[PDB]
Write a protein that binds this DNA or RNA. Structure first.
Ligand SMILES: [Zn+2]
Ligand SMILES: [Zn+2]
Lengths: 289, 49, 101, 781, 64, 196, 49, 57, 57, 114, 69
RNA sequence: GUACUUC
């Protein structure tokens, strides 16, 4: 906070006060709706038989139980079907072609229905590699899709090129937040700490969160969104908590001196030579560094 | 700027790198001077003071 | 299941080779067996239309353990002891003899 | 009832024993040092110097004189110069040559140095004639009580006649009258592939992953060059060298196929081939061989790979001009890549190196835990004297390159008559500087080594320490130092400073300085011995291969399914894993029993289970040099066993004969006090004081004003301390008597008064009765 | 022989080139010319499986 | 320092019912809550993976150390100042400590009743790649005594394994003591020049 | 009076002087060393004037 | 009791008018040359912490 | 200091005239504050003093 | 004619090998150098490895293996080697005899003292 | 080194009772305890002076620069 | 310059 010219932080946290009408039995729906879940968390088993006869790649994507991975994350076949179409296959193109450029430097199912035939040709409209795409609509325990390539890309790895996309794909990405947690209330003050910093998308949930009490840890977002002194009176609580932890006592007057001096010129100061660059006396910059 | 010389046991500081002993020579003299009229020894506890 | 022994020899005539797995083995060319005389150190040699057989037999660790071989039929159920060297092969070709001046 | 004696130890003062010296464990403390420098001369092949100079090679040079297109193609006759025998006899100095003494040499203020001599196997036109010539190269300093100094077979009584201690420890150098001891160092395990995860492999390489496996081979002359193999994200591996200031990322096939007649699937057969179910090895190996058939399809056989190696490495090793690529290629291979197996070792060297590649697949697949660069599982201590021999191996070739550059300096200016004359040989020889004693004295007196070739370790400073003679405790510890390395002082994270419970029994956990050097330099234990000479094996493969182990050429398997047995450097092979569990203690019974002539007792055998992400399975043997040992009481046929570092990790032991239980305990230590060092096992009731108070004491234990030794009238140390009223402690461990500490009194008794009566004492101070000081309380000079 | 995705030559003991990188129906060994292949090789088949360790999730921790 | 013969019987009494708690702690985190020793391969396939990383060890040392700390907290709450031979005020060492003069009550707990559990920084004694904590006992360790927590005091001696754990935890304080002062000085010099 | 490593306003302060012609070691009070955060196990201290 | 190596008359630092350097005209480092105590970065500021100005000068 | 880890310097050489005397008649040569033990935890210097006392008897 | 050593083979022995379509199979085992190559009369065999032997030293353990290695068959003398084949010809059960010395055991009564 | 006269704690002469103590061990076979008692040392402050002496000066004199060997 | 030590 003092030296590093506070930027993207090791752990962005935000405390959210909750109303008196909402209950802990209701907060779990919001922790499962805001928490970000990568595409890897819905995969159970991956086997691929790389046949050749004209490269061919059939991908079998075993899933978990329908009630298991749907109720656990509140994600259903609708969100999972559109995400794979709009994100997984497109990132499958930008990743395989990326490696191509540097390269030269239980019966499953049958009898697909017409609704998935037009849905199959929809992918072929905006994709050129995949030739077949099947999915389990009634139970959702697997996801098989067939690919066809030419001999110009004969040899290449299969698991390591897909696992990246399994971690890069997104099912729903609330900005700058990956997961929300519900800590036990202290001093009767029920709160909700999320692992991120985002105020714009958070202001649209006043039905269950008070916007007058939401506090944050990042000092740049509270500056860009709330103001200068709004960043002052929240970093004061930051270095107050980091000192109240070890039960040591210190007066708030010095903590206000460091607070105001750190934000004395418009936005922020870093107390380093990059922050001392804006000064009047030259010997300050000469003697320091 | 100077020669990628063979292992020299150190290059020779002309002015600037000589004006920074531990990168900050201003600390050697300008910020702290060798104090005259000073003493240094071990201490001992004493009551009746 | 106890069983007896009938044949025990001292001179070698059979051998087993360790080159690789699943060889075509046209089996139409003559190959040589070279002996010595320590003890039990033998080598081999062979040629073909595009193949040359260069082999040895455990130039470092052979004098401590040995191989024996036998056979059994649906009536005998016994094994006749027969000494057998363990050949290790290195199939080579001829694309050598080039150098820079 | 630890009865202390007065008549017996007074009799040892009255007259030293005419027979062998008493308290032999005190002499066994510098056994690492004494045996180190003794090894390079004692034993077969005239020691280590005579075998290393043998493995130096023949260097030739040519003149511009014509022969008499092809006649002009031959540039002329060649001078072949090479050394084959170098020896040091004894330090002599006269006006017949008389004998000099080291204690007399310390008052003489000169360095106690022997006399070096070398013979030159100089030849012409590939040995048409040989001209023998023997000359000296200066005086090399020798330590005390060694194969060269006159204090080797000297009787402990007549040690007093030569003006030194009656129990002289020795093993330290004498340079410019002051004593300096070559500091111990700790390095990587020799002849063992190590899997390690370090992100530094991604900084200097593009698209290179964080995995890595390195092996540290070692020549018979105990030198070493590291063999590192990384893991690339593209699908390949990378081998690199370590030259003067050069590193070359040589691929796997250029360093593997160039060994012997291995151009076949057998490169894949050495890798896991017991089953072909998993394809993570198929895509991996296919990318290696496809990449081999991609950049140069005209390269297929063991000859052209060595012509290409010689072509690329023609100017880096100065192998020129008559040495063709057929000789330079084998030169860079026999001298760099896994040099331990030596010449003619290419029959198993490709099996071990390719198996080292196999474990790289085992590491990146995620079933083998990476080793630690600080744990004592794969860390060996260099004896210091071995570093002296290694320096002599690289510094014996500096004047050889000098005379080579000299005989081709005269060919530039011409006027170089035919070298067939003894006069011309002496003329070109007297111009160069061949004095090496002034350079060995430079390394010792300064501390840092100026290595033209470049050793294997990283730091190029901090190799020797001064002997200030402040007490006997810090001397018996200085001879047992284990310094981690000044390169780690620059490193920030404290993962190495924190202990690791494998230090049990080897290095003391509490004997460690405070402050910045805390956790880095921690001395040895009480009765831990260092093997400084390799046991002549000559039959261990002849008995292991008889116990049921398959041949190294008949196995053609890999993977954790088999138990890979690794003797030092060469691998006998691998067999079914359950045979490793019977042999695990069978070869322990043949080890502890004395009827086996082909198995020494000091043969460490560490067995490893194959389950739960353990280190690569099999069975590891040892017993070379630079190792660490400690005795352990063996219960079956109860006798004294001996084990090493890789033993304590997997198999269990017990510390007291009450913790012994049935069927999962096999070894116990008959003395639970040997865990501590000499200083830590010296303090009474070490199990009652707090650990920060015993580490905070270890410095004071070896920073006393004790009696350094009875040599005052004949020493020449700059600063010296001494006390006179030193008394023996009544409450003392038996080790205080076992090491003859009665000869060196360190402290004295005083009546205690636990009281706040004085007031002046404030929770950290002390009081001394004035009358005691008037009577000589702790008097010193 | 033919194992996995590779077809090794054994009359000279090496690995021949890609049956698709060069003109099909005829492949040649580098060190010596041989009449390859038999034009009846296979329809290539191979299967790879994820190590099941690069998927850090909560429900997999529940499966313990 | 000596306590009554009526006192030490409480020490061995409570320390008898603590030999099973060590196993019950690992039994609580292994999802196999009841009735088995270290014999079942089912529970053998649980903590051999709990030692593969840091977080899985961070979820067992929390319940283990806290429960064992509650075991040693009952001793220090019952024995002193009840089972001691000489007590307040005539007890010199005890009265001096609790009177704020020097030390504290946690300092006399180690010398009077129980030293404690040798805990690293949010951690405990590490485990080898071999899966064993320390070669003094059999592999596949499940116990609080051999798992870092000590049983002996600084009055009647200790066990060498617990002294080794106390030795390793003894240095980790000195290591932090060497880096603690090193990191502090930069905060003063960097902030002063700006705030002069 | 000053003592390294000085870290606060109370680490450096001015004291009165009272000589004693009997010893060689410097002196200090009990309640005084609490501000300096020092001990008497060999801790030396700088005496300015 | 083990008497130690530490200071008996080993520190003994005192200087009123000692020889100064030439490149900087300051007291020479090391007391053997009759040196003087040096104030560092942690003491220069701590001197002005009391607000006593003319002492920093 | 001893070999148990209790450092310290002498504060004043108290004469025998003011040294506390035992029932025997001897005056102890040293004085150790009992207030460092609750923090140094050097019980070894106590139990060893029992052994040293019995050894001296 | 490599190497320059002793000589080439001159004698050969007949091998009864029918190659039947109930089976007549070949038999390969392992054994060390210090053995009873000629003085041995009987060697009991069994199923998967749980057995022993009884000779002078009396420390033996027959070990079987299930999971290349082609044996030549010199049915006559002129070329001195042929190929073993019926339709090469693999081998099913490779054995290996180990010298597993008996483990001294069960004695924890003298080292156990109060 | 040399026998410390004027015992530190008590102040009784000690330098006289060393050869007599050695004679009590040579020609009398008496053990430590009753030897220090018969020798005339009652207080443990004086017992710890004779019983603890090292007698190291005899090892110091084994190097005579004023005499051949 | 390199090494060593003091809270
Ligand atoms: Zn071919
Ligand atoms: Zn006395």
């Amino acid at each position: 906070i003092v030296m590093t010219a506070s930027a993207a932080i090791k752990t962005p946290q935000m405390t959210l006060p909750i109303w008196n009408d909402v209950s802990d039995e209701q907060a779990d729906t919001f922790c499962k709706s805001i928490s970000k879940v990568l595409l890897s968390e819905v995969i159970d088993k991956v086997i691929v038989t790389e046949t050749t006869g004209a490269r061919s790649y059939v991908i079998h994507m075993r899933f978990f139980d329908n009630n298991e991975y749907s109720e656990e994350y509140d994600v259903s076949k609708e969100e999972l079907q559109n995400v794979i179409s709009n994100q997984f296959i497109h990132l499958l193109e930008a990743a395989i072609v990326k490696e191509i450029k540097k390269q030269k430097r239980v019966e499953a199912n049958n009898n697909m229905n017409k609704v998935q035939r037009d849905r199959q040709s929809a992918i072929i409209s905006h994709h050129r590699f995949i030739t077949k795409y099947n999915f389990d609509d009634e139970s959702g325990k697997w996801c098989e899709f067939k690919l066809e390539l030419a001999a110009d890309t004969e040899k290449l790895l299969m698991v390591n090129i897909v696992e990246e996309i399994c971690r890069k794909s997104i099912i729903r990405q609330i900005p700058h937040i990956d997961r929300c947690v519900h800590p036990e209330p202290e001093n009767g003050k029920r709160v909700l700490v999320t692992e991120g910093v985002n105020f714009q998308a958070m202001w649209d949930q006043e039905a269950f969160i008070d916007v007058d009490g939401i506090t944050s840890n990042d000092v740049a977002a509270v500056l860009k969104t709330y103001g200068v002194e709004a960043a002052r009176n929240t970093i004061v609580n930051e270095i107050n908590n980091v000192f109240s932890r070890y039960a040591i006592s210190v007066s708030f007057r010095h903590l206000d001196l460091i607070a105001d001096m750190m934000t004395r010129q418009g936005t922020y100061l870093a107390f380093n030579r990059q922050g001392m660059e804006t000064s009047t006396s030259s010997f300050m910059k000469m003697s320091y560094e | 700027k100077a020669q990628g010389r063979t292992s020299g046991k150190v290059p020779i500081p002309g002015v600037k790198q000589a004006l920074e002993k531990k990168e900050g020579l201003f600390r050697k003299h300008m910020m702290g001077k060798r104090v005259n009229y000073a003493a240094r020894s071990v201490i001992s506890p004493d009551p009746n003071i | 299941s106890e069983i007896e022994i009938e044949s025990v020899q001292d001179q070698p005539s059979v051998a087993v080779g360790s080159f690789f797995k699943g060889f075509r083995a046209p089996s139409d060319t003559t190959f040589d067996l070279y002996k010595k005389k320590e003890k039990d150190e033998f080598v081999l040699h062979g040629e073909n239309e595009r193949l040359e057989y260069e082999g040895y037999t455990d130039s470092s660790s052979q004098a401590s353990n040995q191989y024996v071989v036998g056979l059994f039929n649906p009536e005998k159920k016994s094994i006749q002891l027969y000494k057998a060297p363990v050949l290790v092969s290195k199939v080579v070709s001829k694309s050598s003899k080039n150098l820079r001046g | 009832t630890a009865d202390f004696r007065t008549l017996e130890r007074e009799s040892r003062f009255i007259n030293p024993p005419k027979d062998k010296s008493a308290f032999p464990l005190l002499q066994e403390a510098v056994q690492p040092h004494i045996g180190s420098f003794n090894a390079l001369t004692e034993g077969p092949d005239g020691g280590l110097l005579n075998l290393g100079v043998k493995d130096i090679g023949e260097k030739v040079i040519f003149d511009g004189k014509p022969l008499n297109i092809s006649n002009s193609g031959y540039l002329g006759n060649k001078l072949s110069v090479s050394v084959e025998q170098v020896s040091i006899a004894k330090p002599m100095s006269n006006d017949v040559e008389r004998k000099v003494y080291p204690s007399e040499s310390r008052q003489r203020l000169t360095s106690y140095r022997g006399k070096l001599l070398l013979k030159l196997k100089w030849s012409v036109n590939n040995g048409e004639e040989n001209l023998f010539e023997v000359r000296d190269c200066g005086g090399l300093p020798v330590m005390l009580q060694s194969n060269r100094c006159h204090l080797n077979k000297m009787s402990p009584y007549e040690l007093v006649q030569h003006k030194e201690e009656s129990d002289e420890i020795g093993g330290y150098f004498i340079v410019n009258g002051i004593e300096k001891l070559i500091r111990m160092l700790i390095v990587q395990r020799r002849n063992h592939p190590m899997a390690i995860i370090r992100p530094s492999f991604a900084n200097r390489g593009a698209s290179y992953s964080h995995y890595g496996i390195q092996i540290r081979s070692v020549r018979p002359d105990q030198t070493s060059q590291t063999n590192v193999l990384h893991y690339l994200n593209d699908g390949q591996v990378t081998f690199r060298f370590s030259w003067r200031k050069n590193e070359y990322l040589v691929p796997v096939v250029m360093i593997l196929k160039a060994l012997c007649h291995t151009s076949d699937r057998e490169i894949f057969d050495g890798i896991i081939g017991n089953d072909v179910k998993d394809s993570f090895l198929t895509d991996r190996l296919e990318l290696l061989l496809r990449g081999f058939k991609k950049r140069y399809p005209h390269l297929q056989n063991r000859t052209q790979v060595l012509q290409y190696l010689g072509d690329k490495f023609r100017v880096v090793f100065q192998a020129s001009p008559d040495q063709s690529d057929l000789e330079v290629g084998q030169e860079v291979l026999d001298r760099i890549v896994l040099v331990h197996l030596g010449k003619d070792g290419s029959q198993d060297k490709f099996r071990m190196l390719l198996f080292m590649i196999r474990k790289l697949y085992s590491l990146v697949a995620g079933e083998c835990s990476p080793d630690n660069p600080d744990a004592t599982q794969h860390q060996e201590v260099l004896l210091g004297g071995f570093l002296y021999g290694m320096i002599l191996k690289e510094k014996i070739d500096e004047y050889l390159q000098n005379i080579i550059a000299q005989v081709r300096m005269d060919i530039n200016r011409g006027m170089a008559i035919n070298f067939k004359d003894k006069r011309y040989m002496s003329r070109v020889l007297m111009r160069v500087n061949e004095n090496i004693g002034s350079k060995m004295q430079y390394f010792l007196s300064t501390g840092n080594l100026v290595s033209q070739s470049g050793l294997d370790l990283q730091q190029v400073s901090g190799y020797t320490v001064v002997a200030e003679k402040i007490n006997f405790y810090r001397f018996i510890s200085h001879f047992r130092m284990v310094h981690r390395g000044s390169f780690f002082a620059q490193l920030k994270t404290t993962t190495v400073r924190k202990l690791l419970p494998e230090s049990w029994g080897f290095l003391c956990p509490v004997h460690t300085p405070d402050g910045s050097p805390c956790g880095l330099l921690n001395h040895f234990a009480h009765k831990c011995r260092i093997s400084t000479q390799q046991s002549d094996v000559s039959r261990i493969p002849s008995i292991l291969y008889s116990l049921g182990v398959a041949p190294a050429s008949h196995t053609f398997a890999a993977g954790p399914s088999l138990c890979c047995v690794q003797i030092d450097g060469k691998i006998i092979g691998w067999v079914s894993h359950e045979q490793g569990k019977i042999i695990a203690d069978t070869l322990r019974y043949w080890k502890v029993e004395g009827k086996t002539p082909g198995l020494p007792i000091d043969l460490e055998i560490g067995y490893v289970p194959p389950s739960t992400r353990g280190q690569y399975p099999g069975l590891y043997l040892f017993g070379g040099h630079s190792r660490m040992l400690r005795p352990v009481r063996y219960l079956p046929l109860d006798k004294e066993d001996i084990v090493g570092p890789f033993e304590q990790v997997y198999m269990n032991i017990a510390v007291t004969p009450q913790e012994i239980q049935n069927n999962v305990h096999t070894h116990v230590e008959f003395t639970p006090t040997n865990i501590l060092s000499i200083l830590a096992n010296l303090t009474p009731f070490s199990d009652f004081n707090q650990s920060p108070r015993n580490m905070y004491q270890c410095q004071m234990g070896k920073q006393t004003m004790g009696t350094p030794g009875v040599a005052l009238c004949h020493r020449s140390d700059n600063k010296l301390y001494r006390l006179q009223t030193g008394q023996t402690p009544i409450v003392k461990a038996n080790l205080y008597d076992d090491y003859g500490m009665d000869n060196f009194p360190n402290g004295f008794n005083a009546v205690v008064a636990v009281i706040s009566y004085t007031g002046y004492d404030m929770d950290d101070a002390m009081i001394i009765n004035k009358s005691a000081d008037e009577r000589g309380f702790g008097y010193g000079t | 022989s033919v194992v996995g995705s590779l077809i090794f030559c054994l009359d000279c003991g090496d690995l021949l080139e890609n049956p698709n990188a060069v003109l099909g129906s005829n492949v040649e060994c580098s060190q010596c010319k041989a009449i390859y292949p038999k034009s009846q090789f296979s329809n290539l088949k191979v299967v790879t499986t994820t190590a099941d360790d690069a998927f850090p999730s909560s429900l997999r921790a529940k499966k313990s | 320092l000596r306590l009554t013969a009526e006192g030490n019987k409480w020490r061995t009494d409570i320390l008898k019912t603590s030999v099973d708690t060590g196993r019950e702690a690992a039994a609580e985190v292994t999802n196999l809550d009841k009735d088995t020793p270290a014999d079942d391969p089912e529970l053998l396939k649980r903590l051999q993976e709990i030692l593969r990383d840091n977080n899985k060890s961070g979820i067992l040392d929390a319940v283990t150390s806290s429960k064992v700390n509650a075991i040693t907290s009952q001793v220090v709450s019952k024995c002193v100042p009840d089972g001691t031979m000489k007590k307040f005020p005539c007890n010199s060492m005890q009265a001096m400590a609790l009177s704020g003069a020097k030390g504290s009550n946690v300092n006399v707990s180690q010398i009077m009743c129980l030293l404690g559990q040798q805990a690293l920084e949010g951690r405990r004694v590490p485990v080898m790649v071999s899966g064993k904590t320390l070669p003094s006992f059999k592999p596949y360790e499940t116990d609080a005594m051999a798992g870092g927590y000590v049983k002996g005091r600084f009055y009647s001696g200790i066990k060498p394994q617990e002294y080794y754990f106390h030795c390793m935890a003894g240095r980790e304080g000195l290591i932090d003591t060497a880096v603690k002062t090193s990191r502090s000085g930069y905060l003063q010099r960097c902030l002063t020049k700006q705030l002069e | 009076m000053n003592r390294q490593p000085t870290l606060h306003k109370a680490s450096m302060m001015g004291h009165k002087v009272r000589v004693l012609p009997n010893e060689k070691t410097l002196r200090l009070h009990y309640a005084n060393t609490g501000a300096y955060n020092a001990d008497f196990d060999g801790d030396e201290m700088n005496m300015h004037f | 009791y083990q008497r130690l190596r530490h200071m008996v008359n080993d520190k003994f630092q005192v200087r009123s008018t000692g020889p100064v350097n030439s490149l900087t005209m300051q007291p020479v480092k090391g007391r053997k040359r009759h040196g003087g105590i040096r104030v560092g970065e942690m003491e220069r500021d701590a001197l002005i912490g009391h607000g006593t100005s003319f002492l920093l000068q | 200091s001893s070999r148990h880890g209790q450092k310290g310097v002498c504060s004043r050489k108290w004469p025998t005239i003011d040294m506390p005397f035992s029932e025997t008649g001897i005056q102890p040569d040293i004085i150790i504050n009992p207030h460092a033990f609750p923090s140094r935890m050097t019980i070894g210097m106590f139990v060893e003093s029992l052994a040293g006392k019995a050894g001296a008897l | 004619s490599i190497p320059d050593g002793f000589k080439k083979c001159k004698h050969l022995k007949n091998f009864p090998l029918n190659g039947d379509n109930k089976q007549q199979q070949v038999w390969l085992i392992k054994f060390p150098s210090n053995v009873d190559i000629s003085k041995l009369k009987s060697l009991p065999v069994d199923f998967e490895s749980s057995t022993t032997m009884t000779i002078d030293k009396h420390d033996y353990k027959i070990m079987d293996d299930t999971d290349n290695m082609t044996l030549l068959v010199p049915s006559e003398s002129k070329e001195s080697l042929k190929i073993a084949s019926t339709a090469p010809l693999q081998f099913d059960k490779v054995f290996s005899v180990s010298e597993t010395a008996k483990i001294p055991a069960i004695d924890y009564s003298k080292v156990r003292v109060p | 080194m040399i026998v410390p006269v004027r015992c530190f704690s008590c102040g009784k002469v000690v330098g006289d009772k060393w050869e007599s103590y050695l004679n009590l061990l040579q020609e009398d076979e008496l053990d430590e305890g009753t030897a220090l008692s018969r020798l005339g040392l009652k207080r443990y402050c004086c017992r710890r002076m004779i019983l603890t002496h090292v007698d190291l000066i005899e090892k110091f004199l084994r190097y005579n620069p004023l005499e051949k060997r």
